[PDB]
Coordinates of C-alpha atoms and ligand atoms in Angstrom, one line a residue:
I18 CA 0.0 0.0 0.0
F19 CA 1.6 3.1 -1.2
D20 CA 1.4 6.3 0.8
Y21 CA 1.4 8.2 -2.4
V22 CA 0.7 7.1 -5.9
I23 CA 1.6 9.8 -8.5
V24 CA -0.1 9.3 -11.8
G25 CA 2.0 10.9 -14.7
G26 CA 5.7 11.1 -14.6
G27 CA 5.9 14.4 -16.4
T28 CA 7.0 17.8 -15.3
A29 CA 5.0 18.0 -12.2
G30 CA 5.0 14.1 -11.5
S31 CA 8.8 14.0 -11.5
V32 CA 9.1 16.7 -8.9
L33 CA 6.5 15.1 -6.7
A34 CA 8.0 11.6 -6.9
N35 CA 11.3 13.1 -5.8
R36 CA 10.1 15.5 -3.1
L37 CA 7.7 13.0 -1.5
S38 CA 10.2 10.2 -1.4
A39 CA 12.8 12.3 0.2
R40 CA 11.2 11.2 3.5
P41 CA 11.9 7.4 3.7
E42 CA 8.7 6.5 5.5
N43 CA 6.9 7.8 2.5
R44 CA 6.2 4.9 0.1
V45 CA 5.7 6.4 -3.3
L46 CA 4.9 5.0 -6.6
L47 CA 5.3 7.1 -9.8
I48 CA 3.5 5.7 -12.7
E49 CA 4.3 6.8 -16.2
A50 CA 2.5 5.5 -19.3
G51 CA 5.4 6.2 -21.8
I52 CA 8.8 5.0 -22.0
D53 CA 11.4 5.4 -19.4
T54 CA 14.2 7.9 -20.1
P55 CA 17.0 6.6 -18.0
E56 CA 19.7 9.2 -17.8
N57 CA 22.1 6.8 -19.3
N58 CA 19.8 5.9 -22.2
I59 CA 17.7 8.9 -23.3
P60 CA 16.4 8.6 -26.8
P61 CA 18.8 10.5 -29.1
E62 CA 15.8 12.7 -30.5
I63 CA 15.1 13.6 -27.0
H64 CA 18.6 14.1 -25.7
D65 CA 19.4 16.9 -28.5
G66 CA 18.8 20.1 -26.7
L67 CA 20.0 22.4 -29.5
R68 CA 17.3 21.0 -31.7
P69 CA 14.5 20.7 -29.3
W70 CA 11.9 20.5 -32.2
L71 CA 13.3 17.0 -33.1
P72 CA 10.7 14.9 -31.1
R73 CA 7.9 16.6 -33.1
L74 CA 9.6 15.2 -36.3
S75 CA 9.2 11.5 -35.0
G76 CA 5.5 11.9 -35.5
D77 CA 3.6 10.1 -32.5
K78 CA 6.6 8.4 -31.2
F79 CA 6.9 10.5 -28.0
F80 CA 3.3 11.9 -27.7
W81 CA -0.1 10.8 -27.0
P82 CA -1.1 9.5 -30.4
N83 CA -4.1 11.0 -32.1
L84 CA -4.9 13.4 -29.4
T85 CA -7.0 15.9 -31.3
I86 CA -8.6 19.2 -30.1
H87 CA -10.6 22.1 -31.4
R88 CA -8.6 25.3 -31.4
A89 CA -10.6 28.3 -32.2
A90 CA -13.9 29.3 -31.1
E91 CA -16.7 28.1 -33.4
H92 CA -17.8 31.0 -35.6
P93 CA -20.2 31.4 -38.5
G94 CA -18.8 30.7 -41.9
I95 CA -15.8 28.7 -40.7
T96 CA -15.7 24.9 -40.5
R97 CA -13.1 23.8 -37.9
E98 CA -10.9 20.9 -38.1
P99 CA -9.5 18.9 -35.3
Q100 CA -5.9 19.4 -34.8
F101 CA -3.3 17.1 -33.2
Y102 CA -2.2 18.5 -29.9
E103 CA 1.3 17.4 -28.9
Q104 CA 1.5 16.1 -25.2
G105 CA 4.5 14.2 -23.9
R106 CA 4.1 10.5 -23.4
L107 CA 7.2 9.5 -21.7
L108 CA 9.3 10.0 -18.5
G109 CA 9.7 13.8 -18.1
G110 CA 6.5 14.4 -20.0
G111 CA 6.4 17.9 -21.6
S112 CA 9.8 18.7 -20.3
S113 CA 11.1 15.7 -22.4
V114 CA 9.7 17.0 -25.6
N115 CA 9.4 20.8 -25.2
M116 CA 11.4 23.8 -26.7
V117 CA 13.5 24.1 -23.4
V118 CA 12.6 27.6 -22.6
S119 CA 12.2 28.3 -18.8
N120 CA 10.4 31.5 -17.7
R121 CA 8.3 32.5 -14.7
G122 CA 5.8 35.0 -15.9
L123 CA 5.0 38.3 -14.1
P124 CA 4.3 39.0 -10.4
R125 CA 0.9 40.3 -11.5
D126 CA 0.0 36.7 -12.8
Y127 CA 0.4 35.2 -9.4
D128 CA -1.0 38.1 -7.4
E129 CA -4.1 37.5 -9.6
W130 CA -4.0 33.8 -8.7
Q131 CA -4.3 34.7 -5.0
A132 CA -7.0 37.4 -5.8
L133 CA -9.0 34.6 -7.6
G134 CA -8.9 32.5 -4.3
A135 CA -5.6 30.7 -4.3
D136 CA -4.4 31.7 -0.9
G137 CA -0.5 31.9 -0.7
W138 CA -0.1 31.6 -4.5
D139 CA 0.6 35.3 -4.8
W140 CA 4.0 36.3 -6.2
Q141 CA 5.5 36.5 -2.6
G142 CA 4.3 33.0 -2.1
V143 CA 5.4 31.3 -5.4
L144 CA 8.7 33.0 -5.8
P145 CA 10.6 30.8 -3.1
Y146 CA 9.5 27.8 -5.2
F147 CA 10.8 29.5 -8.4
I148 CA 14.1 30.0 -6.6
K149 CA 14.2 26.5 -5.2
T150 CA 13.8 24.8 -8.5
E151 CA 16.5 26.6 -10.5
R152 CA 20.1 27.1 -10.7
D153 CA 20.4 30.3 -12.8
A154 CA 23.7 30.2 -14.5
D155 CA 23.8 34.0 -15.2
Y156 CA 22.0 35.6 -12.1
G157 CA 21.9 32.8 -9.6
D158 CA 23.3 34.7 -6.8
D159 CA 20.9 37.7 -7.3
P160 CA 18.0 38.1 -4.8
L161 CA 15.2 36.8 -6.9
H162 CA 17.2 33.8 -8.1
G163 CA 18.3 30.4 -7.0
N164 CA 21.7 28.8 -7.4
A165 CA 21.3 25.4 -5.9
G166 CA 18.2 24.0 -7.6
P167 CA 18.0 21.0 -9.8
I168 CA 17.0 22.7 -13.0
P169 CA 19.7 24.9 -14.8
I170 CA 18.5 28.1 -16.5
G171 CA 20.9 30.1 -18.7
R172 CA 20.8 32.5 -21.7
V173 CA 22.9 33.1 -24.7
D174 CA 25.4 36.0 -24.5
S175 CA 24.2 39.0 -26.4
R176 CA 27.6 39.2 -27.9
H177 CA 27.2 35.9 -29.6
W178 CA 23.8 37.3 -31.4
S179 CA 23.7 37.0 -35.1
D180 CA 23.9 40.2 -37.1
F181 CA 20.3 39.5 -38.0
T182 CA 19.2 39.3 -34.4
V183 CA 21.2 42.6 -33.7
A184 CA 19.4 44.4 -36.4
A185 CA 16.1 43.2 -34.9
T186 CA 17.3 44.6 -31.6
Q187 CA 18.1 47.9 -33.2
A188 CA 14.7 48.0 -34.6
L189 CA 13.2 47.3 -31.2
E190 CA 15.4 50.1 -29.6
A191 CA 14.2 52.3 -32.2
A192 CA 10.6 51.6 -30.9
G193 CA 11.8 52.5 -27.4
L194 CA 12.3 49.0 -26.1
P195 CA 15.1 48.1 -23.7
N196 CA 17.2 44.9 -23.3
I197 CA 15.7 43.8 -20.0
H198 CA 18.6 40.9 -20.0
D199 CA 16.7 38.8 -17.5
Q200 CA 13.1 38.1 -18.2
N201 CA 12.8 36.0 -15.0
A202 CA 13.7 38.9 -12.5
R203 CA 12.5 41.9 -14.7
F204 CA 9.1 42.4 -15.5
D205 CA 8.5 45.4 -17.9
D206 CA 8.4 45.4 -21.7
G207 CA 11.5 44.9 -23.8
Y208 CA 13.7 42.4 -25.4
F209 CA 16.1 39.7 -24.0
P210 CA 18.1 36.6 -24.6
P211 CA 15.6 33.9 -23.6
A212 CA 16.2 31.8 -20.5
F213 CA 16.2 28.1 -21.5
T214 CA 17.2 24.9 -19.8
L215 CA 20.0 22.8 -21.2
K216 CA 22.9 21.0 -20.0
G217 CA 25.7 21.7 -22.6
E218 CA 24.1 20.8 -25.7
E219 CA 21.7 18.3 -24.1
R220 CA 18.1 18.5 -23.2
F221 CA 17.7 18.6 -19.3
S222 CA 14.2 17.4 -18.6
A223 CA 12.5 17.1 -15.1
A224 CA 13.4 13.5 -15.4
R225 CA 17.1 14.2 -15.5
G226 CA 16.6 16.8 -12.7
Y227 CA 14.3 15.1 -10.2
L228 CA 14.7 11.5 -11.2
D229 CA 18.3 10.8 -11.4
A230 CA 20.0 7.6 -10.4
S231 CA 20.5 8.3 -6.7
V232 CA 16.8 9.2 -6.5
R233 CA 15.9 6.1 -8.3
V234 CA 17.7 3.8 -5.9
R235 CA 15.7 5.1 -3.0
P236 CA 14.0 1.9 -1.5
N237 CA 10.8 3.9 -0.8
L238 CA 10.4 5.0 -4.4
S239 CA 8.9 2.9 -7.1
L240 CA 8.9 4.0 -10.7
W241 CA 6.6 2.1 -13.2
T242 CA 7.2 2.9 -16.8
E243 CA 5.0 2.0 -19.7
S244 CA 2.2 1.8 -17.4
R245 CA -1.2 3.4 -17.8
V246 CA -3.5 4.3 -15.0
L247 CA -7.0 3.7 -16.2
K248 CA -9.3 4.5 -13.2
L249 CA -9.2 5.7 -9.9
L250 CA -10.4 3.3 -7.3
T251 CA -12.9 4.6 -4.8
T252 CA -14.8 3.8 -1.8
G253 CA -17.5 6.2 -0.8
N254 CA -16.1 9.6 -1.4
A255 CA -12.6 8.3 -0.8
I256 CA -9.9 7.6 -3.5
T257 CA -8.2 4.4 -2.4
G258 CA -6.0 3.4 -5.4
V259 CA -5.6 3.0 -9.0
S260 CA -6.0 0.3 -11.8
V261 CA -3.0 0.2 -14.0
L262 CA -2.3 -1.4 -17.3
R263 CA 1.1 -3.0 -17.9
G264 CA 1.6 -5.2 -20.8
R265 CA -1.8 -6.8 -21.3
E266 CA -2.2 -7.1 -17.5
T267 CA -4.2 -4.7 -15.3
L268 CA -3.2 -4.4 -11.6
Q269 CA -4.7 -2.7 -8.7
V270 CA -2.6 -0.7 -6.5
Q271 CA -3.6 0.6 -3.2
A272 CA -3.0 4.2 -2.2
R273 CA -3.3 6.4 0.9
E274 CA -3.2 9.3 -1.5
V275 CA -3.5 9.6 -5.2
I276 CA -1.8 12.6 -6.8
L277 CA -2.8 13.3 -10.4
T278 CA -0.2 14.8 -12.5
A279 CA -1.4 13.5 -15.9
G280 CA -1.3 16.9 -17.7
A281 CA -3.8 19.5 -18.1
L282 CA -6.0 17.6 -20.5
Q283 CA -5.9 14.1 -19.1
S284 CA -5.9 14.9 -15.3
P285 CA -9.4 16.3 -15.4
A286 CA -10.5 13.6 -17.8
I287 CA -9.4 11.2 -15.0
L288 CA -11.5 13.2 -12.4
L289 CA -14.5 13.2 -14.6
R290 CA -14.4 9.5 -15.1
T291 CA -14.1 9.1 -11.4
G292 CA -17.4 11.0 -11.0
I293 CA -15.9 14.3 -9.9
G294 CA -17.3 17.0 -12.2
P295 CA -20.4 18.7 -13.4
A296 CA -23.2 16.4 -12.2
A297 CA -25.4 16.6 -15.3
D298 CA -22.5 15.7 -17.6
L299 CA -21.5 12.7 -15.6
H300 CA -25.2 11.7 -15.2
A301 CA -25.4 12.1 -19.0
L302 CA -22.6 9.5 -19.3
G303 CA -24.0 7.1 -16.7
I304 CA -21.2 7.9 -14.3
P305 CA -22.4 7.8 -10.7
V306 CA -21.7 11.4 -9.0
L307 CA -19.1 11.5 -6.1
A308 CA -18.9 15.3 -6.1
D309 CA -20.7 17.8 -8.3
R310 CA -17.7 20.0 -9.2
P311 CA -18.7 22.1 -12.2
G312 CA -15.2 23.7 -12.7
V313 CA -13.6 20.3 -13.5
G314 CA -12.4 20.7 -17.2
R315 CA -13.6 24.4 -17.3
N316 CA -11.2 27.3 -17.3
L317 CA -9.0 25.8 -20.0
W318 CA -6.2 28.3 -20.9
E319 CA -3.6 28.5 -23.7
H320 CA -1.7 31.1 -25.5
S321 CA -3.1 32.3 -28.9
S322 CA -0.4 32.2 -31.6
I323 CA 0.3 33.2 -35.1
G324 CA 3.0 33.5 -37.6
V325 CA 4.7 35.9 -39.9
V326 CA 7.2 34.6 -42.4
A327 CA 9.2 36.1 -45.2
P328 CA 11.7 34.6 -47.7
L329 CA 15.3 35.5 -46.7
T330 CA 16.9 37.8 -48.9
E331 CA 20.6 37.6 -49.6
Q332 CA 21.6 40.3 -47.0
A333 CA 19.3 38.7 -44.4
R334 CA 20.5 35.1 -45.0
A335 CA 24.2 36.4 -44.7
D336 CA 23.3 38.2 -41.5
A337 CA 21.3 35.2 -40.1
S338 CA 24.7 33.5 -39.9
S339 CA 20.7 27.4 -33.0
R340 CA 20.1 28.3 -29.4
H341 CA 17.2 30.6 -28.4
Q342 CA 18.5 34.1 -29.4
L343 CA 15.8 36.7 -28.8
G344 CA 12.5 37.2 -27.0
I345 CA 10.2 40.2 -26.9
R346 CA 7.8 41.0 -24.1
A347 CA 5.3 43.7 -25.5
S348 CA 2.0 45.5 -24.7
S349 CA -0.8 45.3 -27.2
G350 CA -2.5 48.3 -25.9
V351 CA -5.8 46.5 -26.1
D352 CA -6.6 46.5 -22.3
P353 CA -4.9 48.7 -19.6
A354 CA -5.2 45.7 -17.2
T355 CA -2.9 43.5 -19.4
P356 CA 0.5 45.0 -20.1
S357 CA 3.0 42.6 -21.5
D358 CA 0.2 40.5 -23.0
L359 CA 2.2 39.7 -26.2
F360 CA 5.4 37.7 -26.6
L361 CA 7.3 37.8 -29.7
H362 CA 10.2 36.1 -31.5
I363 CA 12.2 37.4 -34.4
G364 CA 14.7 35.4 -36.1
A365 CA 15.8 33.7 -39.2
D366 CA 16.3 30.3 -40.4
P367 CA 18.6 29.8 -43.4
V368 CA 17.6 26.0 -43.4
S369 CA 13.9 26.7 -44.4
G370 CA 14.9 30.0 -46.1
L371 CA 12.5 31.9 -43.8
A372 CA 12.7 34.9 -41.4
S373 CA 10.1 34.7 -38.9
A374 CA 8.3 36.8 -36.5
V375 CA 6.1 34.5 -34.4
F376 CA 4.2 35.5 -31.5
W377 CA 1.3 34.8 -29.2
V378 CA -1.2 36.5 -26.8
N379 CA 0.5 35.8 -23.5
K380 CA -2.1 37.2 -21.3
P381 CA -5.4 36.2 -22.9
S382 CA -9.1 36.7 -22.1
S383 CA -10.5 33.6 -23.9
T384 CA -11.1 30.3 -22.1
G385 CA -12.5 27.1 -23.2
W386 CA -13.2 23.5 -21.7
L387 CA -12.9 19.8 -22.1
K388 CA -15.5 17.2 -21.5
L389 CA -15.6 13.4 -21.8
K390 CA -17.0 11.8 -24.9
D391 CA -17.9 8.7 -23.0
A392 CA -16.8 6.5 -19.8
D393 CA -14.1 4.5 -21.6
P394 CA -10.7 5.1 -19.8
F395 CA -9.1 4.7 -23.3
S396 CA -10.9 7.7 -24.9
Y397 CA -9.3 11.3 -24.9
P398 CA -11.6 14.1 -23.8
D399 CA -13.4 16.3 -26.2
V400 CA -11.3 19.5 -25.9
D401 CA -12.3 22.9 -27.2
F402 CA -9.7 25.7 -26.4
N403 CA -12.4 28.2 -27.6
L404 CA -9.6 30.5 -28.8
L405 CA -10.5 34.1 -29.8
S406 CA -14.0 33.7 -28.2
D407 CA -13.4 36.9 -26.3
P408 CA -12.7 39.6 -28.9
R409 CA -9.9 41.2 -27.0
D410 CA -7.7 38.3 -28.0
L411 CA -8.5 39.1 -31.7
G412 CA -7.6 42.7 -30.8
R413 CA -4.3 41.5 -29.4
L414 CA -3.4 39.4 -32.3
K415 CA -4.1 42.4 -34.8
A416 CA -2.1 44.7 -32.5
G417 CA 0.8 42.3 -32.5
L418 CA 0.9 42.2 -36.2
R419 CA 0.8 45.9 -36.3
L420 CA 3.8 46.0 -34.0
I421 CA 5.6 43.6 -36.4
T422 CA 4.8 45.9 -39.3
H423 CA 6.2 48.8 -37.2
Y424 CA 9.4 47.0 -36.3
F425 CA 10.0 45.7 -39.8
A426 CA 9.7 49.3 -41.0
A427 CA 12.7 50.4 -38.9
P428 CA 15.9 51.0 -40.9
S429 CA 17.7 48.2 -39.4
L430 CA 15.3 45.5 -40.5
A431 CA 13.7 47.4 -43.5
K432 CA 17.2 47.3 -45.3
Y433 CA 16.7 43.5 -45.8
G434 CA 13.5 44.2 -47.8
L435 CA 11.6 41.2 -46.4
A436 CA 8.1 40.6 -47.8
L437 CA 6.2 39.4 -44.7
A438 CA 3.2 37.0 -45.0
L439 CA 1.0 35.4 -42.3
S440 CA 1.6 31.8 -41.4
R441 CA 0.5 29.2 -38.9
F442 CA 2.6 29.4 -35.8
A443 CA 3.7 25.7 -35.2
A444 CA 5.2 24.9 -38.6
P445 CA 5.7 28.2 -40.2
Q446 CA 5.4 28.1 -44.0
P447 CA 4.3 29.9 -47.3
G448 CA 0.6 30.1 -48.3
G449 CA -0.8 32.9 -46.2
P450 CA -1.5 36.4 -47.4
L451 CA 0.9 39.3 -47.3
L452 CA 0.9 41.0 -43.9
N453 CA 0.5 44.5 -45.5
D454 CA -2.4 43.5 -47.5
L455 CA -4.3 41.7 -44.8
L456 CA -3.8 44.5 -42.3
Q457 CA -5.6 46.6 -45.0
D458 CA -8.6 44.4 -44.9
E459 CA -10.0 43.8 -41.6
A460 CA -12.8 41.2 -42.2
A461 CA -10.3 39.1 -44.1
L462 CA -7.7 39.4 -41.4
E463 CA -10.4 38.3 -38.8
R464 CA -11.2 35.4 -40.9
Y465 CA -7.7 34.4 -41.3
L466 CA -6.8 34.6 -37.7
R467 CA -9.9 32.7 -36.7
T468 CA -9.0 30.0 -39.1
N469 CA -5.3 29.7 -38.4
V470 CA -4.9 30.6 -34.7
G471 CA -2.7 28.2 -33.0
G472 CA -1.7 27.3 -29.5
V473 CA 1.8 27.1 -27.8
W474 CA 1.2 23.7 -25.8
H475 CA 0.5 25.7 -22.7
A476 CA -2.7 23.9 -21.8
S477 CA -3.8 24.7 -18.2
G478 CA -6.3 25.5 -15.6
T479 CA -8.7 22.5 -15.9
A480 CA -8.7 21.6 -12.3
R481 CA -8.1 25.1 -10.7
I482 CA -7.0 26.0 -7.1
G483 CA -10.0 28.0 -5.8
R484 CA -11.5 29.3 -2.6
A485 CA -13.0 26.7 -0.4
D486 CA -16.6 28.2 -0.9
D487 CA -16.2 28.6 -4.7
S488 CA -18.4 26.1 -6.5
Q489 CA -16.2 26.5 -9.6
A490 CA -13.0 25.8 -7.7
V491 CA -11.5 22.2 -8.1
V492 CA -8.6 22.0 -5.7
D493 CA -7.6 23.9 -2.6
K494 CA -4.2 25.7 -2.0
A495 CA -2.5 22.3 -1.4
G496 CA -4.2 20.6 -4.4
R497 CA -6.8 18.6 -2.4
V498 CA -9.6 17.9 -4.6
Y499 CA -12.7 19.5 -3.1
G500 CA -15.4 16.7 -2.3
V501 CA -13.3 13.7 -1.9
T502 CA -10.6 12.4 0.1
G503 CA -7.5 10.8 -0.8
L504 CA -7.0 12.8 -4.0
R505 CA -4.8 15.6 -5.1
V506 CA -4.0 17.3 -8.5
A507 CA -0.6 18.9 -8.8
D508 CA 0.0 19.7 -12.5
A509 CA -0.7 22.6 -14.9
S510 CA -4.4 21.8 -14.6
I511 CA -4.4 23.6 -11.2
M512 CA -3.3 27.1 -12.4
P513 CA -6.3 29.5 -11.9
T514 CA -5.0 31.3 -15.1
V515 CA -2.3 30.6 -17.5
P516 CA 0.7 32.9 -16.6
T517 CA 2.5 35.4 -19.0
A518 CA 5.0 32.7 -19.5
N519 CA 5.7 29.3 -21.1
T520 CA 4.0 26.8 -18.7
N521 CA 7.0 24.5 -17.8
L522 CA 8.9 26.6 -15.2
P523 CA 5.6 27.5 -13.6
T524 CA 4.7 23.8 -13.4
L525 CA 7.8 22.9 -11.8
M526 CA 7.3 25.6 -9.3
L527 CA 3.8 24.6 -8.5
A528 CA 4.9 21.0 -8.0
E529 CA 7.5 22.1 -5.6
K530 CA 5.0 24.2 -3.8
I531 CA 2.5 21.5 -3.6
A532 CA 5.1 19.0 -2.5
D533 CA 5.9 21.4 0.3
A534 CA 2.2 21.7 1.4
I535 CA 2.2 17.9 1.5
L536 CA 5.3 17.5 3.5
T537 CA 4.3 20.4 5.9
Ligands
FAD620 C1 5.9 20.3 -28.0 C2 5.8 21.1 -26.6 C3 6.5 22.2 -26.4 C4 6.7 22.9 -25.3 N1 7.5 23.9 -25.2 C5 7.7 24.5 -23.9 C6 8.7 25.3 -23.7 O1 9.6 25.6 -24.5 N2 8.9 25.8 -22.3 C7 7.9 25.6 -21.5 O2 8.1 26.4 -20.4 N3 6.8 25.0 -21.7 C8 6.7 24.4 -22.9 N4 5.7 23.5 -23.1 C9 4.7 23.1 -22.0 C10 5.3 22.3 -20.8 O3 6.3 21.4 -21.2 C11 4.1 21.8 -20.2 O4 3.2 22.8 -19.8 C12 4.5 20.9 -19.0 O5 5.2 19.9 -19.4 C13 3.3 20.6 -18.2 O6 3.5 19.6 -17.2 P1 2.7 18.6 -16.5 O7 3.2 17.8 -15.3 O8 1.3 19.3 -16.2 O9 2.3 17.7 -17.7 P2 3.2 16.8 -18.7 O10 4.8 17.1 -18.5 O11 2.6 16.7 -19.9 O12 3.2 15.3 -17.8 C14 1.9 14.5 -17.9 C15 2.5 13.0 -17.8 O13 1.4 12.2 -17.5 C16 1.6 11.0 -18.3 N5 0.2 10.5 -18.3 C17 -0.8 10.9 -18.7 N6 -1.9 10.2 -18.6 C18 -1.4 9.1 -17.8 C19 -2.0 7.9 -17.3 N7 -3.2 7.6 -17.5 N8 -1.1 7.0 -16.8 C20 0.2 7.2 -16.6 N9 0.8 8.3 -17.1 C21 0.0 9.3 -17.8 C22 2.2 11.3 -19.6 O14 2.7 10.4 -20.3 C23 3.1 12.5 -19.1 O15 4.4 12.1 -19.0 C24 5.7 22.6 -24.3 C25 4.8 21.6 -24.5 C26 4.9 20.7 -25.7 C27 3.9 19.6 -25.9

């Protein structure tokens, strides 16, 4: 009988398995559905940190196969297609297959968490957990940084920037933007070398960080790889264990405490199947109701993304002569409440022959939801990110595009004479209209955006921390699921809102914090 069964050996699951098992009396099982990634035998596609997009070139190999989602809000005169949503399926989860960038967001993100009912999750309260996770190679001795944590964070030196990146930076300075240097302790608009997590040229997932060999030899830690949890075992309103599929064999495992860390799309599907969710939905699926919690699978957040590409002209290609070089935090101007609501990257890829300015709404207004299609443990949920449902997000994307127009008009970048066209975010390519033309035609620009808006794999919020009297809350400040015993959620599902950040570093932090709450 395990004290803790942790379901999902991803970003959050890895931290929890490590921190909980640090006390020897704690018998802890970490169950991960995908392949193990032993530090001495990491798949070479995974292991290459300089080319972190490589896993997404192995098709399904490292993801949840055929996990499809709806992206944009349904809207008259557009037929939406389902879209494959990458989610890691292996030890380290998203941290094993992501683009290696590691940023925290803005104080205001977390102060809003507390304001929305997550007591002690304000900036003051999360910051120790950001410090504890990291070893910042550049600023680690400075006050808002850690120097001892398991996860390294570093940035390229600005002096190593390509002539192309420099030119972009001169363009941004011309618009009045500073180099803020450290996006993780400086929180106003400007540009910077992005903080990323690598070890030399190698990926450094949370499995490398939290589940190294010494941790693995702990007699009180069990690690089940290629093992899929199918159902939560209950008695009364108490979670009591898990049924797990290994080979063809299903096992029951008893547990004092189940902690779900199965990712923001699969953690709430597991709750819903257990009978924890909106009652009428569950009734509709013949699922007996443990707890009527209507926030389970609501409040699904993401960042809403788009691309601009241009063929590289000779000057630009010469100047563009792998690591994350440049990031831009900017304000759309669409809502006073949401400075720094846009993130942008400007760079060039001589390989595809494209210069790119890709960007997303980092502080969005739109949210969607996910539900079960049926009771089958094998089904994915029905997911609808509902992007651009709130018109402010459409406003933000248009603002971003104008900013790009403005920056590329600056002498430093206009000299290249790039003809910029719209593109999908995730695999940027030709085929979209010219930027200058679309910005001249508003309805056509609205239709394009609604049609081609993407995500940035920052799914979150589906089992939100909320106040103990909030009918729409799912978990309390320590991740305990309201209405049942024996169950916690401790992944990106619990974020009351997505931060102004890529979600990995915030997921590490929240797992450290939740581990602390448990150990305290
Ligand atoms: C392609 C991609 C690129 C990204 N780029 C970045 C980036 O550059 N920077 C950044 O900060 N964030 C980025 N993200 C997001 C970030 O990596 C995720 O938000 C983060 O990994 C979420 O962590 P988690 O623990 O919630 O989920 P995950 O790390 O996804 O972990 C969930 C784990 O649960 C396992 N699991 C699921 N269901 C079951 C089950 N029934 N049984 C057993 N195991 C199960 C999965 O196999 C997985 O290992 C990216 C994500 C993707 C997909």
